Amino acid sequence: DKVAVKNAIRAAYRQVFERDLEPYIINSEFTALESKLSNNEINVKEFIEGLGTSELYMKEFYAPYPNTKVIEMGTKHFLGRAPLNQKEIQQYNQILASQGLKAFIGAMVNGMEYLQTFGEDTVPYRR
């Protein structure tokens, strides 16, 4: 039950950030979400969205890389698969170009494929 959340918190940090985050990095932006997830006030999907919309995520996977890698990184993180094709990429690039990062992040986590593949209480994984 609590170990069940415990599993997810960790699970989702490695999925998104590819690493286990240090307590203080958590203390910076994830204190609320962990609690909500813990207190059963938000689901995994939501917590996974707190991640993509985190500032740490933009630093970690946007600040460095380019539009193509930014996008390549996101599909593998939130959809657990590479981009379907340049098309989806161009399709994705425009999201960014018009509403920014969060936009992009939301289009996947709030998408049908995501909802059908993972649901709301399942952490994305490489499919």
Swiss-Prot record:
What residue stretches are annotated with the PBS-linker domain?
A: 1-127
- PTM: Contains one covalently linked bilin chromophore. This protein autochromophorylates.
Where does the UniProt annotation locate this protein? Cellular thylakoid membrane
Q: Please give the subunit comment from the record.
A: Heterodimer of ApcF (a variant beta-allophycocyanin). Phycobilisomes of this organism are composed of a two cylinder core, from which six rods radiate. The core is mainly composed of allophycocyanin alpha and beta chains and of minor components.
Q: What does this protein do?
A: This protein is postulated to act both as terminal energy acceptor (by its phycobilin-like domains) and as a linker polypeptide (by its repeats and arms) that stabilizes the phycobilisome core architecture. Has intrinsic bilin lyase activity.
Indicate the family of this protein: Belongs to the phycobilisome linker protein family.
From the Swiss-Prot or TrEMBL record, give the protein name: Phycobiliprotein ApcE
Organism from which the protein derives:
Synechocystis sp. (strain ATCC 27184 / PCC 6803 / Kazusa)
